[PDB]
Design a protein around this nucleic acid. Sequence first.
RNA 1: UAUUAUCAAAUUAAAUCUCAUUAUUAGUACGCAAGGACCAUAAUGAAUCAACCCAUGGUGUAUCUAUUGAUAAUAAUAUA
RNA 2: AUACUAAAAUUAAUAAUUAUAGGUUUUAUAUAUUAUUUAUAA
RNA 3: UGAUAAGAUAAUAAAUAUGUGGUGUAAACGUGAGUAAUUUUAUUAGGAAUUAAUGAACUAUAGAAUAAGCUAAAUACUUAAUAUAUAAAAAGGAUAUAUAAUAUAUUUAUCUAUAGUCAAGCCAAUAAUGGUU
RNA 4: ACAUAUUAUUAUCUUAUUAUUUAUAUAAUAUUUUUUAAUAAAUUUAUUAAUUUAUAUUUAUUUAUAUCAGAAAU
Lengths: 290, 25, 110
Amino acid sequence: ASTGEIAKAKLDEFLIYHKTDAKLKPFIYRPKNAQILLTKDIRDPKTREPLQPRPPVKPLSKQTLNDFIYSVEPNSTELLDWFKEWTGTSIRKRAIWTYISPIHVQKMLTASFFKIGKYAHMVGLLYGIEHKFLKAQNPSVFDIEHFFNTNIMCALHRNRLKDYKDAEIAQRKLQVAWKKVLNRKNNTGLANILVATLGRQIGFTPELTGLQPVDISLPDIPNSSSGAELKDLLSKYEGIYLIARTLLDIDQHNAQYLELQEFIRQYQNALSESSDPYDTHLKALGLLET
Amino acid sequence: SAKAVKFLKAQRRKQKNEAKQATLK
Amino acid sequence: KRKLISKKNKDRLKAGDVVRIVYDSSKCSYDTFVGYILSIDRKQLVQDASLLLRNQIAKTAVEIRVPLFSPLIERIDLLTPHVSSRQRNKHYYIRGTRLDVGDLEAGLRR
RNA sequence: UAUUAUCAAAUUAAAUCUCAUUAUUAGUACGCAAGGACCAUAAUGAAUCAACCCAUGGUGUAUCUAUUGAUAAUAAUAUA
RNA sequence: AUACUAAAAUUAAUAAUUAUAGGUUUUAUAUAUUAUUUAUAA
RNA sequence: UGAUAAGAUAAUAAAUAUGUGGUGUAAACGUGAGUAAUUUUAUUAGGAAUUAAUGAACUAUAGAAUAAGCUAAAUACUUAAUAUAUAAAAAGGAUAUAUAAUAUAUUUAUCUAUAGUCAAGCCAAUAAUGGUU
RNA sequence: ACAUAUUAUUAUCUUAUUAUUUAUAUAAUAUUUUUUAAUAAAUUUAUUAAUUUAUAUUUAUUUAUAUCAGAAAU
Ligand SMILES: [Mg+2]
Ligand SMILES: [Mg+2]
Ligand SMILES: [Mg+2]
Ligand SMILES: [Mg+2]
Ligand SMILES: [Mg+2]
Ligand SMILES: [Mg+2]
Ligand SMILES: [Mg+2]
Ligand SMILES: [Mg+2]
Ligand SMILES: [Mg+2]
Ligand SMILES: [Mg+2]
Ligand SMILES: [Mg+2]
Ligand SMILES: [Mg+2]
Ligand SMILES: [Mg+2]
Ligand SMILES: [Mg+2]
Ligand SMILES: [Mg+2]
Ligand SMILES: [Mg+2]
Ligand SMILES: [Mg+2]
């Protein structure tokens, strides 16, 4: 019983609870109604068998998703099709669509890119569901820092370790990425450096519209030596650390920038317990691809 | 039960009216 | 089953409960029986105890005595608990009165 | 065939001893056909008998509960 | 075990061991209320 | 269009009436078992209790097309705002104007009010076979 | 002497269904709402148990009254 497995069970029970009929919920999830359920003896989908009792259901925590995302196996529908099955729900239901937070996109991206190895499936899935989210009145999930910046992170990851020289395709892909972005919150993280790096790598001149020249001011990580507080402080800033690590690894013009490297060093000070996830993913991707 | 009750009431009214008619005559 | 009839158990079977007896399909070809517990008969030996149940099917009245520890029955399910109207351990006297069981399966399915 | 405790043979006096149906042999043998077996076995019963009470049914002046009428008693306070 | 008989069990209180009947204590049976009901502890 | 064979968007051309939903069986057809008139039929230049907020479904005008839910989704169902003092109601399907979902027209649908039309409920008088064994 | 049917009636037996009654509910779902244990993030108001709480609720109905059908009777 792995942590990812128990998280999968929790979220599966959550989605089953929300997908079950409203009039039936009292007789599936309220122990006070067990005898009434026994008496009235409803049938299952396609009348398989009598309804089974279940315990109450409470809200679902956010970490249950990224936990399995990182602790996934090389390949399985369990996570490959989770996004499709989760989004295959009526926009009317509110919990299923409001659980998704902007900080989960860069979580799902890593597992597909490195461990699962089928990142094309996830990138394909993130097209027809944009308008569905728009109807579901949760358009803020696809933001800039967690979605646009992470998208260019994955794009540069593709271009590195593999041969890429198509300037026209790079330009078109940048434009469609800007199209996919539908929540304009420009924060410390700046994708100007990334677009310049891709432009000089593939021969194409950076071109966009509506972008802001926000300076990078990642919150410096202090010298805390606490426990839960330390790990939570690291957790809430994991992603931008990976951004800075990719920038240092790739961009040779990074010398003029100083916030990235100092923030990286402070994050490593906080991370002294474990190794660097950026090179962890590099190793995983290399060994899986080779 | 109730049928017998209302039947007895009806006969009571019948005989009372008969007695009234006889007394008047 | 011992806990089902345990005198030290508040939620035990009492005369008045309507129960369903389920038979094991691998060991016999019997059908479940819905009946009104007329009596719980316990003896010196624990294994040798029985339920006396009654049911008026259509307009024929049947009563069935089952050994509660016969290996041919898997479990017995309580369909509806007893009411406090009756005032004895063994409700033999309901036979033929307005207290009688009637068509239990039809009532339940109603 | 000269004790006692125990186990006991041959004998003697009795009890018992049974009878239907069904099935296979075999629709065979026998028969123009209709019908249709002896020789054997097995199963279910009948009738009689012997024992037993785990269970079921009866009883159950053991016992417990409800109730009608009359009467009497103990305990509480109250009064003397 | 039994009409009385006859048969069978026990008559222990011990420098070493035995339960016959009643009473007593447990575990059950019956009776019919029963968590509200139990005495409890904490 | 995922720099790879994944899932979507939009269009042209098609499939499904074994999934939800609407309309149609209060008619027509057949029959005469009942039924003798306190509850039926026929007839009045008949009556009021001075007859539903009755439209059933086409005309003639006016107006109106909205919010939440539940269903997979709706022109499915439920609760809610007005609009001739009443707690009085609904619906969307096919262009062209607009994105690096609506505003307007044409089309058929939906709802309410006032009349018309077709239609409804209940009464009176007279009549309706034989047996008084 | 007597026999067998058919129909109809009630001051009479049970009696499916429904209809009117009365009547208590962790109430059965909620609403409602004292509310109370929590949820759960990057630091939330159903969601269960229960606890509202009179609103409807239901099936028990708690008590009766009508009623298809069939019993005896005339
Ligand atoms: Mg001998
Ligand atoms: Mg002989
Ligand atoms: Mg012999
Ligand atoms: Mg003999
Ligand atoms: Mg016996
Ligand atoms: Mg005995
Ligand atoms: Mg007995
Ligand atoms: Mg006995
Ligand atoms: Mg002595
Ligand atoms: Mg003894
Ligand atoms: Mg003794
Ligand atoms: Mg001793
Ligand atoms: Mg259809
Ligand atoms: Mg007709
Ligand atoms: Mg005609
Ligand atoms: Mg509308
Ligand atoms: Mg409608």
